[PDB]
Scaffold this active site. Structure first.
Site, PDB file in Angstrom:
ATOM      1  N   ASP A 124       3.134  -1.307  -0.643  1.00  0.00           N
ATOM      2  CA  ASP A 124       4.297  -0.892  -1.435  1.00  0.00           C
ATOM      3  C   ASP A 124       4.967   0.295  -0.749  1.00  0.00           C
ATOM      4  OD1 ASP A 124       4.779  -0.790  -4.950  1.00  0.00           O
ATOM      5  OD2 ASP A 124       5.993   0.313  -3.498  1.00  0.00           O
ATOM      6  N   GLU A 136       2.858 -11.462   2.741  1.00  0.00           N
ATOM      7  CA  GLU A 136       1.535 -12.061   2.842  1.00  0.00           C
ATOM      8  C   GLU A 136       0.753 -11.813   1.555  1.00  0.00           C
ATOM      9  OE1 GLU A 136       0.352  -9.139   6.304  1.00  0.00           O
ATOM     10  OE2 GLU A 136      -0.422 -11.207   6.704  1.00  0.00           O
ATOM     11  N   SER A 169       5.871  -0.583  -7.348  1.00  0.00           N
ATOM     12  CA  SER A 169       6.670   0.578  -7.721  1.00  0.00           C
ATOM     13  C   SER A 169       7.815   0.171  -8.645  1.00  0.00           C
ATOM     14  CB  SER A 169       7.200   1.261  -6.458  1.00  0.00           C
ATOM     15  OG  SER A 169       7.760   0.302  -5.573  1.00  0.00           O
ATOM     16  N   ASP A 196       3.149   7.521  -1.318  1.00  0.00           N
ATOM     17  CA  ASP A 196       2.542   6.928  -2.505  1.00  0.00           C
ATOM     18  C   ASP A 196       1.148   6.382  -2.195  1.00  0.00           C
ATOM     19  OD1 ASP A 196       3.523   4.453  -5.040  1.00  0.00           O
ATOM     20  OD2 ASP A 196       2.477   6.396  -5.230  1.00  0.00           O
ATOM     21  N   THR A 198       2.722   9.724  -7.000  1.00  0.00           N
ATOM     22  CA  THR A 198       1.837   9.570  -8.145  1.00  0.00           C
ATOM     23  C   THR A 198       1.132  10.899  -8.401  1.00  0.00           C
ATOM     24  OG1 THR A 198       1.536   7.208  -7.691  1.00  0.00           O
ATOM     25  CG2 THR A 198      -0.132   8.275  -9.042  1.00  0.00           C
ATOM     26  N   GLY A 205       9.409  -3.598 -10.464  1.00  0.00           N
ATOM     27  CA  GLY A 205       9.250  -5.026 -10.645  1.00  0.00           C
ATOM     28  C   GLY A 205       7.844  -5.542 -10.414  1.00  0.00           C
ATOM     29  N   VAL A 255       4.805  -8.470  -9.140  1.00  0.00           N
ATOM     30  CA  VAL A 255       4.382  -9.217  -7.961  1.00  0.00           C
ATOM     31  C   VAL A 255       3.690 -10.477  -8.454  1.00  0.00           C
ATOM     32  CG1 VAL A 255       2.970  -9.191  -5.853  1.00  0.00           C
ATOM     33  CG2 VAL A 255       4.147  -7.100  -6.603  1.00  0.00           C
ATOM     34  N   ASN A 272      -2.575   0.907  -4.320  1.00  0.00           N
ATOM     35  CA  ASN A 272      -1.613   0.425  -3.336  1.00  0.00           C
ATOM     36  C   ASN A 272      -2.288  -0.105  -2.081  1.00  0.00           C
ATOM     37  OD1 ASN A 272       0.673   0.891  -4.817  1.00  0.00           O
ATOM     38  ND2 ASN A 272       1.324   2.671  -3.654  1.00  0.00           N
ATOM     39  N   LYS A 318      -2.613   5.699  -2.665  1.00  0.00           N
ATOM     40  CA  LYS A 318      -3.560   5.635  -3.790  1.00  0.00           C
ATOM     41  C   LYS A 318      -4.303   4.310  -3.723  1.00  0.00           C
ATOM     42  CE  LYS A 318       0.233   4.176  -6.831  1.00  0.00           C
ATOM     43  NZ  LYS A 318       0.979   4.532  -8.105  1.00  0.00           N
ATOM     44  N   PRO A 319      -5.480   4.201  -4.353  1.00  0.00           N
ATOM     45  CA  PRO A 319      -6.257   2.956  -4.239  1.00  0.00           C
ATOM     46  C   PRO A 319      -5.534   1.743  -4.797  1.00  0.00           C
ATOM     47  CG  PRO A 319      -7.679   4.738  -4.983  1.00  0.00           C
ATOM     48  CD  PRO A 319      -6.275   5.291  -4.941  1.00  0.00           C
TER      49      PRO A 319
END
Lengths: 353, 18
Positions: free
Chosen positions: A187, A124, A56, A169, A204, A58, A60, A174, A171-172
Protein backbone atom coordinates in the site's frame (compact mmCIF):
# COMPACT_ATOMS: atom_id res chain seq x y z
CA UNK A 1 40.34 -1.50 14.06
CA UNK A 2 37.18 -3.56 13.79
CA UNK A 3 38.17 -5.03 10.37
CA UNK A 4 41.28 -6.52 8.84
CA UNK A 5 42.34 -5.79 5.26
CA UNK A 6 40.26 -8.53 3.62
CA UNK A 7 36.99 -7.80 5.40
CA UNK A 8 37.38 -4.03 4.94
CA UNK A 9 38.00 -4.39 1.21
CA UNK A 10 35.01 -6.73 0.85
CA UNK A 11 32.67 -4.35 2.67
CA UNK A 12 33.91 -1.40 0.64
CA UNK A 13 33.32 -3.30 -2.57
CA UNK A 14 29.85 -4.36 -1.48
CA UNK A 15 28.92 -0.78 -0.69
CA UNK A 16 30.13 0.42 -4.12
CA UNK A 17 28.06 -2.32 -5.77
CA UNK A 18 24.97 -1.02 -3.96
CA UNK A 19 25.69 2.44 -5.38
CA UNK A 20 25.99 1.03 -8.91
CA UNK A 21 22.73 -0.86 -8.47
CA UNK A 22 20.84 2.15 -7.16
CA UNK A 23 22.03 4.36 -10.03
CA UNK A 24 20.62 1.89 -12.57
CA UNK A 25 17.43 1.54 -10.53
CA UNK A 26 16.87 5.29 -10.48
CA UNK A 27 17.36 5.53 -14.26
CA UNK A 28 14.72 2.84 -14.81
CA UNK A 29 12.30 4.35 -12.27
CA UNK A 30 12.50 7.82 -13.76
CA UNK A 31 11.66 6.61 -17.29
CA UNK A 32 8.42 5.07 -15.99
CA UNK A 33 7.75 7.94 -13.58
CA UNK A 34 7.82 10.44 -16.45
CA UNK A 35 5.83 8.22 -18.88
CA UNK A 36 3.36 6.09 -16.92
CA UNK A 37 1.22 3.26 -18.32
CA UNK A 38 -2.57 3.19 -18.25
CA UNK A 39 -5.77 1.42 -19.34
CA UNK A 40 -4.40 -2.14 -19.54
CA UNK A 41 -7.70 -4.07 -18.91
CA UNK A 42 -11.43 -3.86 -18.01
CA UNK A 43 -13.76 -5.02 -15.23
CA UNK A 44 -15.68 -7.77 -16.99
CA UNK A 45 -12.34 -9.51 -17.66
CA UNK A 46 -12.44 -10.60 -13.99
CA UNK A 47 -14.59 -12.71 -11.68
CA UNK A 48 -14.97 -11.20 -8.20
CA UNK A 49 -14.22 -13.83 -5.54
CA UNK A 50 -13.85 -12.39 -2.02
CA UNK A 51 -12.94 -9.25 -0.10
CA UNK A 52 -9.43 -9.54 1.37
CA UNK A 53 -9.38 -6.32 3.39
CA UNK A 54 -9.23 -2.57 3.05
CA UNK A 55 -6.26 -0.49 1.98
CA UNK A 56 -5.45 3.10 2.82
CA UNK A 57 -8.46 3.93 0.63
CA UNK A 58 -11.12 1.56 -0.67
CA UNK A 59 -11.31 -2.22 -0.46
CA UNK A 60 -9.13 -5.00 -1.88
CA UNK A 61 -10.81 -7.97 -3.56
CA UNK A 62 -9.53 -11.32 -4.74
CA UNK A 63 -10.41 -11.62 -8.45
CA UNK A 64 -9.78 -14.20 -11.18
CA UNK A 65 -8.84 -13.21 -14.73
CA UNK A 66 -11.43 -14.96 -16.91
CA UNK A 67 -9.29 -15.68 -19.99
CA UNK A 68 -6.24 -17.02 -18.11
CA UNK A 69 -7.55 -18.20 -14.74
CA UNK A 70 -4.83 -16.19 -12.96
CA UNK A 71 -5.76 -14.68 -9.59
CA UNK A 72 -5.05 -11.11 -8.55
CA UNK A 73 -5.74 -8.68 -5.73
CA UNK A 74 -7.78 -5.73 -6.99
CA UNK A 75 -8.00 -2.44 -5.09
CA UNK A 76 -11.30 -0.62 -5.78
CA UNK A 77 -11.50 3.13 -5.16
CA UNK A 78 -14.83 4.96 -5.27
CA UNK A 79 -14.13 8.20 -7.14
CA UNK A 80 -16.85 10.18 -5.33
CA UNK A 81 -15.60 8.99 -1.92
CA UNK A 82 -12.00 9.82 -2.85
CA UNK A 83 -13.02 13.36 -3.81
CA UNK A 84 -15.05 13.80 -0.63
CA UNK A 85 -12.10 12.69 1.49
CA UNK A 86 -9.62 15.00 -0.32
CA UNK A 87 -7.62 11.96 -1.53
CA UNK A 88 -7.54 12.60 -5.32
CA UNK A 89 -3.81 13.32 -5.33
CA UNK A 90 -3.02 10.36 -3.07
CA UNK A 91 -4.80 7.85 -5.31
CA UNK A 92 -3.24 9.15 -8.55
CA UNK A 93 0.20 9.18 -6.88
CA UNK A 94 -0.14 5.64 -5.50
CA UNK A 95 -0.81 4.18 -8.96
CA UNK A 96 1.97 6.33 -10.44
CA UNK A 97 4.46 4.95 -7.91
CA UNK A 98 3.34 1.36 -8.30
CA UNK A 99 3.72 1.37 -12.07
CA UNK A 100 7.23 2.91 -11.83
CA UNK A 101 8.99 0.95 -9.04
CA UNK A 102 10.53 -2.51 -9.35
CA UNK A 103 11.93 -4.40 -6.36
CA UNK A 104 11.48 -8.01 -5.14
CA UNK A 105 9.67 -6.97 -1.94
CA UNK A 106 7.26 -4.45 -3.53
CA UNK A 107 3.93 -5.72 -4.80
CA UNK A 108 3.63 -5.47 -8.55
CA UNK A 109 0.84 -3.69 -10.40
CA UNK A 110 -0.37 -5.94 -13.23
CA UNK A 111 -3.30 -3.94 -14.66
CA UNK A 112 -5.08 -0.67 -14.04
CA UNK A 113 -8.28 0.83 -15.48
CA UNK A 114 -11.32 2.91 -14.52
CA UNK A 115 -15.03 3.25 -15.22
CA UNK A 116 -17.90 5.63 -14.48
CA UNK A 117 -17.78 5.10 -10.68
CA UNK A 118 -14.43 3.57 -9.65
CA UNK A 119 -10.70 3.24 -10.13
CA UNK A 120 -9.16 -0.25 -10.20
CA UNK A 121 -5.60 -1.41 -9.46
CA UNK A 122 -5.01 -5.10 -10.16
CA UNK A 123 -1.92 -6.27 -8.26
CA UNK A 124 -0.27 -9.60 -7.64
CA UNK A 125 -2.19 -11.74 -5.15
CA UNK A 126 0.00 -12.48 -2.12
CA UNK A 127 -1.69 -15.54 -0.65
CA UNK A 128 0.09 -15.94 2.70
CA UNK A 129 -1.81 -13.10 4.34
CA UNK A 130 -0.70 -10.15 6.43
CA UNK A 131 2.27 -10.21 8.79
CA UNK A 132 -0.23 -8.73 11.29
CA UNK A 133 -2.22 -12.01 11.33
CA UNK A 134 0.79 -14.23 11.80
CA UNK A 135 2.26 -11.99 14.53
CA UNK A 136 -0.98 -11.85 16.51
CA UNK A 137 -1.40 -15.65 16.10
CA UNK A 138 1.97 -16.68 17.55
CA UNK A 139 2.47 -13.68 19.89
CA UNK A 140 5.99 -12.58 19.03
CA UNK A 141 8.70 -13.53 16.54
CA UNK A 142 12.08 -14.87 17.75
CA UNK A 143 14.87 -12.41 16.92
CA UNK A 144 16.20 -14.35 13.85
CA UNK A 145 12.62 -14.46 12.45
CA UNK A 146 12.11 -10.74 13.06
CA UNK A 147 15.57 -10.08 11.58
CA UNK A 148 14.72 -11.91 8.33
CA UNK A 149 11.70 -9.62 7.80
CA UNK A 150 13.54 -6.52 8.99
CA UNK A 151 16.36 -7.09 6.49
CA UNK A 152 13.84 -7.04 3.64
CA UNK A 153 12.45 -3.72 4.90
CA UNK A 154 15.95 -2.23 5.20
CA UNK A 155 16.71 -3.12 1.55
CA UNK A 156 13.29 -1.89 0.43
CA UNK A 157 13.69 1.50 2.15
CA UNK A 158 17.23 1.77 0.79
CA UNK A 159 15.73 1.35 -2.68
CA UNK A 160 12.77 3.66 -2.14
CA UNK A 161 14.83 6.43 -0.52
CA UNK A 162 17.27 6.37 -3.45
CA UNK A 163 14.28 7.38 -5.59
CA UNK A 164 13.42 10.24 -3.15
CA UNK A 165 10.31 8.34 -2.05
CA UNK A 166 9.27 8.37 1.62
CA UNK A 167 6.97 5.44 2.45
CA UNK A 168 5.21 6.77 5.64
CA UNK A 169 2.95 3.83 6.48
CA UNK A 170 5.10 0.91 7.66
CA UNK A 171 3.17 -1.56 9.87
CA UNK A 172 2.46 -5.32 9.98
CA UNK A 173 -0.97 -4.78 8.42
CA UNK A 174 0.74 -3.51 5.24
CA UNK A 175 3.23 -6.38 4.88
CA UNK A 176 2.03 -9.51 3.09
CA UNK A 177 3.76 -12.90 3.22
CA UNK A 178 4.27 -14.62 -0.14
CA UNK A 179 4.34 -18.34 -0.92
CA UNK A 180 8.12 -18.47 -0.28
CA UNK A 181 7.82 -16.70 3.11
CA UNK A 182 9.21 -13.36 1.91
CA UNK A 183 7.55 -9.99 2.53
CA UNK A 184 5.68 -7.79 0.04
CA UNK A 185 4.95 -4.13 0.78
CA UNK A 186 1.49 -3.48 -0.63
CA UNK A 187 0.00 0.00 0.00
CA UNK A 188 1.54 3.32 -1.16
CA UNK A 189 -1.38 5.59 -0.31
CA UNK A 190 0.71 7.96 1.84
CA UNK A 191 4.07 7.69 0.03
CA UNK A 192 5.52 10.82 -1.55
CA UNK A 193 8.43 11.81 -3.75
CA UNK A 194 10.10 14.50 -1.60
CA UNK A 195 13.35 16.32 -2.44
CA UNK A 196 14.20 16.94 1.22
CA UNK A 197 11.85 18.22 3.97
CA UNK A 198 8.05 17.80 4.11
CA UNK A 199 5.37 18.44 6.75
CA UNK A 200 2.20 16.35 6.28
CA UNK A 201 0.61 14.81 9.38
CA UNK A 202 -0.06 11.29 7.99
CA UNK A 203 0.64 7.64 8.72
CA UNK A 204 -0.51 5.33 11.48
CA UNK A 205 -0.27 6.69 15.06
CA UNK A 206 1.83 3.98 16.71
CA UNK A 207 4.41 4.19 13.89
CA UNK A 208 4.81 8.01 13.72
CA UNK A 209 8.15 9.61 14.43
CA UNK A 210 8.01 12.52 16.91
CA UNK A 211 8.83 15.04 14.18
CA UNK A 212 5.70 13.97 12.22
CA UNK A 213 3.52 14.61 15.27
CA UNK A 214 5.19 17.92 16.09
CA UNK A 215 4.87 20.95 13.80
CA UNK A 216 8.48 20.80 12.60
CA UNK A 217 9.21 19.41 9.18
CA UNK A 218 10.70 15.98 8.59
CA UNK A 219 12.52 13.88 6.01
CA UNK A 220 13.03 10.26 4.98
CA UNK A 221 14.38 9.42 8.47
CA UNK A 222 10.79 9.01 9.65
CA UNK A 223 10.86 5.64 7.82
CA UNK A 224 13.84 4.51 9.88
CA UNK A 225 11.99 5.44 13.09
CA UNK A 226 9.06 3.36 11.80
CA UNK A 227 11.45 0.44 11.17
CA UNK A 228 12.42 0.66 14.84
CA UNK A 229 8.73 0.46 15.80
CA UNK A 230 8.21 -2.54 13.50
CA UNK A 231 11.24 -4.43 14.81
CA UNK A 232 10.15 -3.75 18.38
CA UNK A 233 6.58 -4.92 17.67
CA UNK A 234 7.78 -8.05 15.85
CA UNK A 235 10.12 -9.05 18.67
CA UNK A 236 7.91 -8.01 21.64
CA UNK A 237 4.44 -8.71 20.25
CA UNK A 238 3.29 -5.12 20.91
CA UNK A 239 4.59 -1.71 19.79
CA UNK A 240 6.74 0.52 22.01
CA UNK A 241 4.17 3.32 22.38
CA UNK A 242 0.48 2.49 22.83
CA UNK A 243 -2.77 3.88 24.24
CA UNK A 244 -6.50 3.81 23.44
CA UNK A 245 -6.74 6.91 21.22
CA UNK A 246 -4.44 8.68 18.71
CA UNK A 247 -3.89 11.83 20.82
CA UNK A 248 -2.77 9.69 23.77
CA UNK A 249 -0.45 7.61 21.56
CA UNK A 250 1.16 10.82 20.30
CA UNK A 251 1.84 11.93 23.88
CA UNK A 252 3.67 8.67 24.60
CA UNK A 253 5.82 9.02 21.46
CA UNK A 254 6.78 12.60 22.21
CA UNK A 255 7.43 11.77 25.87
CA UNK A 256 9.65 9.19 24.21
CA UNK A 257 10.57 6.84 27.07
CA UNK A 258 11.26 3.41 25.56
CA UNK A 259 11.45 0.33 27.75
CA UNK A 260 12.32 -3.12 26.47
CA UNK A 261 11.15 -6.65 27.36
CA UNK A 262 13.69 -8.52 29.40
CA UNK A 263 14.06 -11.14 26.65
CA UNK A 264 15.44 -8.62 24.15
CA UNK A 265 19.09 -9.18 23.35
CA UNK A 266 21.57 -6.40 24.07
CA UNK A 267 22.26 -6.10 20.34
CA UNK A 268 18.54 -5.60 19.66
CA UNK A 269 18.19 -2.96 22.37
CA UNK A 270 21.18 -1.09 20.98
CA UNK A 271 19.79 -1.08 17.45
CA UNK A 272 16.39 0.06 18.68
CA UNK A 273 17.82 2.92 20.77
CA UNK A 274 19.56 4.12 17.61
CA UNK A 275 16.39 3.86 15.44
CA UNK A 276 13.88 5.11 18.06
CA UNK A 277 16.10 8.13 18.50
CA UNK A 278 14.37 11.50 18.83
CA UNK A 279 17.59 13.42 17.99
CA UNK A 280 17.97 13.49 14.18
CA UNK A 281 21.71 14.15 14.51
CA UNK A 282 21.95 10.71 16.09
CA UNK A 283 19.27 8.55 14.41
CA UNK A 284 20.58 5.64 12.35
CA UNK A 285 19.70 5.97 8.68
CA UNK A 286 20.16 9.74 8.93
CA UNK A 287 23.93 10.11 9.50
CA UNK A 288 27.00 10.46 7.29
CA UNK A 289 27.16 6.65 6.77
CA UNK A 290 23.48 6.46 5.75
CA UNK A 291 21.91 3.01 5.59
CA UNK A 292 25.27 1.38 6.31
CA UNK A 293 24.98 2.24 10.02
CA UNK A 294 21.96 -0.09 10.07
CA UNK A 295 23.30 -2.79 7.75
CA UNK A 296 26.61 -3.01 9.64
CA UNK A 297 25.05 -3.04 13.13
CA UNK A 298 25.85 -6.07 15.33
CA UNK A 299 22.19 -7.24 15.34
CA UNK A 300 22.49 -7.79 11.55
CA UNK A 301 25.91 -9.47 11.71
CA UNK A 302 24.48 -12.77 10.45
CA UNK A 303 22.48 -11.16 7.63
CA UNK A 304 23.70 -11.93 4.09
CA UNK A 305 22.17 -8.88 2.38
CA UNK A 306 22.77 -10.08 -1.18
CA UNK A 307 21.31 -13.51 -0.38
CA UNK A 308 18.15 -11.85 1.01
CA UNK A 309 17.86 -9.76 -2.16
CA UNK A 310 18.30 -12.86 -4.34
CA UNK A 311 15.69 -14.65 -2.19
CA UNK A 312 18.13 -17.50 -1.51
CA UNK A 313 17.71 -17.52 2.29
CA UNK A 314 15.30 -20.11 3.67
CA UNK A 315 12.35 -18.32 5.24
CA UNK A 316 11.33 -19.04 8.86
CA UNK A 317 7.62 -19.41 8.04
CA UNK A 318 6.05 -20.84 4.87
CA UNK A 319 2.31 -20.20 4.59
CA UNK A 320 -0.01 -23.09 3.93
CA UNK A 321 -1.61 -22.67 0.51
CA UNK A 322 -4.38 -24.99 -0.70
CA UNK A 323 -4.54 -24.31 -4.41
CA UNK A 324 -5.28 -21.22 -6.49
CA UNK A 325 -7.52 -18.59 -4.94
CA UNK A 326 -7.30 -20.04 -1.44
CA UNK A 327 -8.11 -17.28 1.08
CA UNK A 328 -7.55 -19.26 4.29
CA UNK A 329 -4.78 -16.86 5.44
CA UNK A 330 -7.12 -13.82 5.41
CA UNK A 331 -9.86 -12.54 7.69
CA UNK A 332 -13.46 -12.37 6.50
CA UNK A 333 -15.02 -9.02 5.64
CA UNK A 334 -18.49 -7.79 4.78
CA UNK A 335 -19.10 -8.18 1.03
CA UNK A 336 -20.43 -5.03 -0.66
CA UNK A 337 -21.53 -4.96 -4.30
CA UNK A 338 -19.39 -3.12 -6.85
CA UNK A 339 -21.83 -0.53 -8.22
CA UNK A 340 -21.13 1.15 -11.58
CA UNK A 341 -23.33 4.19 -12.28
CA UNK A 342 -24.82 4.90 -15.74
CA UNK A 343 -23.20 8.35 -15.50
CA UNK A 344 -19.49 9.18 -15.37
CA UNK A 345 -18.32 10.66 -12.06
CA UNK A 346 -15.41 13.02 -11.48
CA UNK A 347 -13.97 12.37 -14.93
CA UNK A 348 -11.80 15.48 -15.14
CA UNK A 349 -10.29 14.85 -11.70
CA UNK A 350 -9.03 11.37 -12.62
CA UNK A 351 -7.88 11.88 -16.22
CA UNK A 352 -4.33 10.77 -15.40
CA UNK A 353 -5.36 7.44 -13.85
CA UNK B 1 2.80 -6.08 32.91
CA UNK B 2 3.43 -4.11 29.73
CA UNK B 3 1.68 -6.79 27.67
CA UNK B 4 -1.33 -6.78 30.03
CA UNK B 5 -1.49 -2.99 29.66
CA UNK B 6 -1.44 -3.36 25.86
CA UNK B 7 -4.37 -5.79 25.92
CA UNK B 8 -6.23 -3.53 28.36
CA UNK B 9 -5.87 -0.22 26.59
CA UNK B 10 -3.63 -0.50 23.53
CA UNK B 11 -5.09 -0.98 20.07
CA UNK B 12 -4.70 -4.76 19.51
CA UNK B 13 -6.55 -5.01 16.16
CA UNK B 14 -5.84 -3.62 12.74
CA UNK B 15 -4.86 0.03 12.80
CA UNK B 16 -5.98 2.61 10.27
CA UNK B 17 -3.91 5.48 9.03
CA UNK B 18 -4.99 8.94 10.15
Amino acid sequence: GHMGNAAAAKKGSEQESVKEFLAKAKEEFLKKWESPSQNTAQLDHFDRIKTLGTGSFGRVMLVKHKETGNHYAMKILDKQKVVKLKQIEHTLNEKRILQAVNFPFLVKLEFSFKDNSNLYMVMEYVPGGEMFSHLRRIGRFSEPHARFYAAQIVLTFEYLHSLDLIYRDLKPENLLIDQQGYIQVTDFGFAKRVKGRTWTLCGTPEYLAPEIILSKGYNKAVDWWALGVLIYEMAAGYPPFFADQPIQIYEKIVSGKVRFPSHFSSDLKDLLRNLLQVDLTKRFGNLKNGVNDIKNHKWFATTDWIAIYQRKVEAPFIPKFKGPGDTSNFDDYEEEEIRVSINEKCGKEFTEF
Amino acid sequence: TTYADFIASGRTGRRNAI
